[PDB]
Design an enzyme around this catalytic site. Structure first.
Site, PDB file in Angstrom:
ATOM      1  N   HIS A  43       0.816  -1.217   0.000  1.00 26.92           N
ATOM      2  CA  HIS A  43       0.000   0.000   0.000  1.00 26.92           C
ATOM      3  C   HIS A  43       0.846   1.262   0.000  1.00 26.92           C
ATOM      4  CE1 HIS A  43       0.055  -0.592   4.553  1.00 26.92           C
ATOM      5  NE2 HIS A  43       0.381   0.685   4.483  1.00 26.92           N
ATOM      6  N   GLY A 144       2.297   5.447  10.079  1.00 25.68           N
ATOM      7  CA  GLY A 144       3.689   5.422   9.664  1.00 25.68           C
ATOM      8  C   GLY A 144       4.514   4.220  10.119  1.00 25.68           C
ATOM      9  N   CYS A 146       3.762   0.919   9.366  1.00 27.23           N
ATOM     10  CA  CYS A 146       3.732  -0.215   8.466  1.00 27.23           C
ATOM     11  C   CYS A 146       5.126  -0.525   7.957  1.00 27.23           C
ATOM     12  CB  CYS A 146       2.796   0.048   7.285  1.00 27.23           C
ATOM     13  SG  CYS A 146       1.143   0.027   7.896  1.00 27.23           S
TER      14      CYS A 146
END
Lengths: 302, 302
Positions: A43, A144, A146
């Site tokens: 993503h 932030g 991930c």
């Protein structure tokens, strides 16, 4: 009497040297740099204004190598990009000189692993979690984070098992294995998703009761016994996992002289109520400590 | 609903590069190599068959530089030895090239810090603890773990606050500051020692209740209020520490719109009983999470 049992993580240094920042367009998160490969959540390609139900196949095709920027806190030039499930595999021109001995693996419900929480490619804390029976973890992850990774260690070899992807509505977290699959039936989509029911991990509850005995706390032990088969039938009706013993549980049974089947009976009774008594300072059953944790932290056995 | 609150340690890499093995005679434990100095517990000089009530002044005099062997897992030649309280300060001929920016400091009851548990100079796990009001910590330490260090971090600077020394009869642990003093009234002697009574850390309980509100769990909040002064008088009679607010608690009060004094009242009531209700899945008050932890892990505020 303090059990000597704490939430214990692997030292994080080896993994710290593998963390990078990956940016694509409007999005920035973390990646894992091993050899000439940087892994990160897919993503990152998704426009921060369209994370709902994205079409990753089309986003992928729209990218070129220059669409990705990898930074170590150095710039690593991207010379290849691929998608494996919910992860990207970016090939870079420099191999990581701090690459440890490693494998990939998949962690199973009830098993513990260490997490390195990073923001912007920068490690900020470490903690340990158990993979819940509904394939979430009870972590501590903000925007932030991930791309943060979870791992176990066997000797000198780091076994990477988790790359963080999302928070669910109930505040628990999930992510991917390095084969690109999400744990559970979760999708990396910012939409409503069913969540399976959690359960007590019977094996870890047994470990915990053994820890209590090893600390001198044994009032819940009676000569009464439930077999493994009869416990497991009970368990299905009661939101416990079915019990499956291991050699590490057998060791605890031997050190204490108390049989698994006596603690299965104890669990069936404690589930209905402790009745004012405590167990290692707790009034409910604890399933966040594994048989391995008990063997290692109390008895010095790895 | 999972709070998002976990036991979170600093990444351990920077400290990992500072750990060495120190051997003297029959004894082996860990040391901390900063610049040209190796710090380690002074009972390394003590004959493993006489750890009871040793005379360290005489053991010290009996040693020469060659009586100490420092090993990084390299041999660091000892060219100076001194004793500061319960610690040795060995000067070696090589400065540690991985020496981080650092200070020494002393941690106060209620405050959290990270620990790197090592055996034989080899880091084996990390965990975080709170300094209890009786100046023990509830750690996970076995034989051979002395010299393990505890530290906080502010920015890039590592603040070393603890070098592990002993286990008490109740399974809790204590050690030294890097000024050589033991925390509390403890001595580094393997004899019977009084232990002060533990207490709930009021400020950390307040933090915990705020965390619960930030997670939507606020049933314990009434408009009723206890002042700080009246709470503190109550606290002395009830094995709570006296409450002393901080800016980090004020932030939580502001984010939630719930006043410290309402949660002091709530504590006074919950202390007598939760009455079937839970708070973040707990049936007793939790004092292992600090206002700083809540601000950082739930709100993104360092």
């Amino acid at each position: 009497h303090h059990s000597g049992l704490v939430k214990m993580s692997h030292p994080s240094g080896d993994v710290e040297a593998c963390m990078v920042q990956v940016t694509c367009g409007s999005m920035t998160l973390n990646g894992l740099w091993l050899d000439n490969t940087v892994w990160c959540p897919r993503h990152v390609m998704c426009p921060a204004d369209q994370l709902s139900d994205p079409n990753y196949d089309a986003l992928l095709i729209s990218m070129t190598n220059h669409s990705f920027s990898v930074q170590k806190h150095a710039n690593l030039r991207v010379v290849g990009h691929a998608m494996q499930g919910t992860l990207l595999k970016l090939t870079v021109d420099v191999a990581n000189p701090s690459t440890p001995a490693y494998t990939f693996t998949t962690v199973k419900p009830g098993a513990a692993f260490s997490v390195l929480a990073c923001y912007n490619g920068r490690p900020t804390g470490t903690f340990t979690v158990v993979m819940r029976p509904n394939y979430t973890i009870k972590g501590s992850f903000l925007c932030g984070s991930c791309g943060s990774v979870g791992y176990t260690k066997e000797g000198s070899v780091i076994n990477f098992c988790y790359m963080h992807q999302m928070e669910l509505a109930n505040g628990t977290h999930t992510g991917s294995a390095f084969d690109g699959t999400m744990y559970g039936a979760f999708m990396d989509k910012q939409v409503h998703q069913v969540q399976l029911t959690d359960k007590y991990c019977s094996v870890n509850v047994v470990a915990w009761l053994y820890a209590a005995i090893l600390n001198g706390c044994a009032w819940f032990v009676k000569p009464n016994r439930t077999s493994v088969v009869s416990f497991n039938e009970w368990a299905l009706a009661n939101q416990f996992t079915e019990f499956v013993g291991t050699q590490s549980v057998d060791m605890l049974a031997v050190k204490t002289g108390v049989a698994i089947e006596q603690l299965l009976y104890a669990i069936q009774q404690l589930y209905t109520g402790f009745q004012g008594k405590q167990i290692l300072g707790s009034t409910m059953l604890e399933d966040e400590f594994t048989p391995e944790d008990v063997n290692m932290q109390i008895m010095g056995v790895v």
